[PDB]
Scaffold this active site. Structure first.
Site, PDB file in Angstrom:
ATOM      1  CG  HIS A  18      38.809  39.782  39.120  1.00 45.59           C
ATOM      2  ND1 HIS A  18      38.556  40.723  39.832  1.00 45.59           N
ATOM      3  CD2 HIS A  18      39.499  40.392  37.859  1.00 45.59           C
ATOM      4  CE1 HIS A  18      39.087  41.961  39.181  1.00 45.59           C
ATOM      5  NE2 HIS A  18      39.521  41.713  38.081  1.00 45.59           N
ATOM      6  CG  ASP A  38      41.989  39.911  28.805  1.00 45.57           C
ATOM      7  OD1 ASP A  38      40.779  40.991  29.073  1.00 45.57           O
ATOM      8  OD2 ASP A  38      43.097  40.304  28.937  1.00 45.57           O
TER       9      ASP A  38
END
Ligand SMILES: *[C@@H]1O[C@H](CO)[C@@H](O)[C@H](O)[C@H]1NC(C)=O
Ligand SMILES: *[C@@H]1O[C@H](CO)[C@@H](O)[C@H](O)[C@H]1NC(C)=O
Ligand SMILES: *[C@@H]1O[C@H](CO)[C@@H](O)[C@H](O)[C@H]1NC(C)=O
Ligand SMILES: *[C@@H]1O[C@H](CO)[C@@H](O)[C@H](O)[C@H]1NC(C)=O
Length: 438
Positions: free
Chosen positions: A53, A182
């Site tokens: 991100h 993740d």
């Protein structure tokens, strides 16, 4: 000018490039010994991007601690002069968790760059896109898609009125969720404390001197080592949260010397190396899900995995299509570190010294800043060449060609697909996922 779509954030690079995973993306294309260009006689037939991100505000937790620390410095200190003067009045007004304007733009830029680099495919092929389910990761996915779609519209070669690129799958970060991007289900790895130990051991080797100088300069103030690293963190967060990201380095930055930034940066590589990379016994094991997804994509065959992958998601062509040519995945730095290591990419790297700084030669290309800066990107390419019947795999990390390991690499960093996949026997066997529970 120092901040561009193509070269990323090259402003004040003597400081900004040593913030580790708090460094704004900066292109390493010039630091690549091997040329990133598609070689002559070669055509790219596959491209996957795994992106972090963009630049963000501090998490709410860290933000409360930064903000409380600065008040305390304001209540207690008597001398705020020279480089310290700004601190008397500094008014903490950072937001929390969300992408900053700057971070939004990094990912727009990243979409532009991915669209352009693979234009002879992005003109008519809509990438299949996934994102870890965290607001900042999702927002990032959409900004990336924004910049991609802007560029497609301006491209005379683009086949128009195709469906939009969108986030096809949002993968849950809940504690029960199998998330390849993740993972949070490996109980034993989730409990690990190796990183904290290493963090403390190394911080004790360079932070006390800084602590001392700060208490010296700000009479009335008393600081922990940890607090000093908070004021170091503020240098990145106060630079890239503001309108002046391109023109002014934060004043926090100049409270610390270049040599101290070198230690900071290295500290940041340590946290990642022992937290999520090969330094942690179950770190590379966090990457095997994604590595097995990558292999399915490269071989156009069903995912063979029993670690972090969700089988409901992956056994359906709708949520895991095997022949899409272009793929984009969005995630957090920690998951990206595990994946980089599960793919063998830093198997030339010796375990990082916990006592002494190691330059980027000693660590053979590994560092937080060089791998998972804000808006980091990894590209996996498959290409077809004149003299070779087999597809050749190539990997770039933030625009640096990174020579594959585990397979006979050629001088251009590549291996044949079949030999690259065979090399990934650690991921193919499930790595050490069986140890998540015993
Ligand atoms: C797998 O994905 C489905 C579809 O999004 C979801 O409802 C389910 O929770 C997931 N299961 C696991 C173990 O993550
Ligand atoms: C400020 O003083 C308070 C109260 O004496 C003390 O507890 C605190 O640790 C000090 N903080 C700093 C950052 O100097
Ligand atoms: C999730 O992963 C676990 C642990 O590897 C696995 O045994 C389970 O069957 C998976 N669930 C789904 C829905 O994929
Ligand atoms: C990379 O080295 C690790 C170190 O143990 C090993 O498990 C792994 O299989 C190697 N991967 C490749 C692709 O060589």
């Amino acid at each position: 000018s120092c901040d561009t779509v193509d070269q990323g954030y090259q402003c004040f690079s003597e400081t900004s490039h040593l913030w580790g995973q708090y460094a704004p993306f900066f292109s390493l294309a010039n630091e690549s010994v091997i040329s990133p260009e598609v070689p002559a006689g070669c055509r790219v037939t596959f491209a996957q991007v795994l992106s972090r991100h963009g630049a963000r505000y501090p998490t709410d937790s860290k933000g409360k601690k930064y903000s409380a620390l600065i008040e305390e410095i304001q209540q207690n200190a008597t001398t705020f002069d020279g480089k310290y003067a700004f601190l008397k009045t500094y008014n903490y007004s950072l937001g929390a968790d969300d992408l900053t304007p700057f971070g939004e733009q990094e990912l727009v830029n990243s979409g532009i760059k991915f669209y352009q680099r693979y234009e002879s495919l992005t003109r008519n092929i809509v990438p299949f896109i996934r994102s870890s389910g965290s607001s900042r990761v999702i927002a990032s996915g959409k900004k990336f898609i924004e910049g991609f779609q802007s560029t497609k519209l301006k491209d005379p070669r683009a086949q128009p009125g195709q469906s939009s690129p969108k986030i096809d799958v949002v993968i849950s970060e809940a504690s029960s969720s199998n998330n390849t991007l993740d993972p949070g289900t490996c109980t034993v790895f989730e409990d690990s404390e190796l990183a904290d130990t290493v963090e403390a051991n190394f911080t004790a080797t360079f932070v006390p001197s800084i602590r001392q100088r700060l208490e010296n300069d700000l009479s009335g103030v008393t600081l922990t080592d940890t607090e000093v690293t908070y004021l170091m963190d503020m240098c990145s967060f106060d630079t890239i949260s503001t309108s002046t990201v391109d023109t002014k380095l934060s004043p926090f930055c100049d409270l610390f010397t270049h040599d101290e930034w070198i230690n900071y940066d290295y500290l940041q590589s340590l946290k990642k190396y022992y937290g999520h990379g090969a330094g942690n016994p179950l770190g590379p094991t966090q990457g095997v899900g994604y590595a097995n997804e990558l292999i399915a994509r490269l071989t156009h065959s069903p995912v063979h995995d029993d670690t972090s992958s969700n089988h409901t998601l992956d056994s359906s062509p709708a949520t895991f299509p095997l022949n899409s040519t272009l793929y984009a995945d969005f995630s957090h730095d920690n998951g990206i570190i595990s994946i980089l290591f599960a793919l063998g990419l830093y198997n030339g790297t010796k375990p990082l010294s916990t006592t002494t700084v190691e330059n980027i030669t000693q660590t053979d290309g590994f560092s937080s800043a060089w791998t998972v800066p804000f808006a980091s990107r990894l590209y996996v390419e498959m290409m077809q060449c004149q003299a070779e019947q087999e597809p050749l795999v190539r990997v770039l990390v933030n625009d640096r060609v990174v020579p594959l390991h585990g397979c006979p690499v050629d001088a251009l960093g590549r291996c044949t697909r079949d030999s690259f996949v065979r090399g990934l026997s650690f991921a193919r066997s499930g790595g050490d996922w069986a140890e998540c529970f015993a």
